[PDB]
């Protein structure tokens, strides 16, 4: 397959690591990224808990909400980390290490 990643709107910040790897952006999760990946999962788990008390699905609804929130939070953390890496986000933490 012929792939070509390129943004029409160029990155405003330094553009280090134009095409990072999956495990690299996974390993670039800052404290803020972990915090925002955890808060979404917590909100999802508690919403799944509170919603599933009338039908009687006390726990499995919480597990399903946990799956949804975990996927969403990891997606958000990955999006922020990658966008910071390609450059078009305020980095101030990657140029320091690079």
């Amino acid at each position: 397959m012929n792939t070509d990643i390129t943004a029409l709107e160029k990155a405003q910040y330094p553009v280090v690591d134009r095409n990072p790897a999956f495990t690299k952006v996974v390993g670039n999760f800052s404290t803020l990224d972990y915090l925002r990946f955890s808060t979404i999962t917590g909100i999802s788990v508690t919403v799944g808990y509170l919603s599933g008390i009338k039908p009687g699905i006390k726990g499995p609804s919480m597990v399903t909400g946990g799956l949804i929130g975990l996927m969403g939070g990891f997606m958000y953390a990955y999006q922020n980390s990658a966008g910071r890496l390609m450059g078009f986000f305020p980095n101030d933490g990657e140029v320091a290490s690079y």
């Binding site: 925002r36 999962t41 808990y49 919480m62």
Partner: peptide
């Protein structure tokens, strides 16, 4: 009367409190 003795609600409560901590940090750290 020393333990809640519910192996299903406690995980929900800890999830709620860590969600609150995450919210306050996200407001503060950003």
């Amino acid at each position: 009367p020393k333990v809640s003795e519910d192996k299903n609600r406690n995980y929900a409560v800890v999830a709620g409190v860590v969600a609150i901590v995450g919210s306050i940090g996200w407001y503060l750290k950003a």
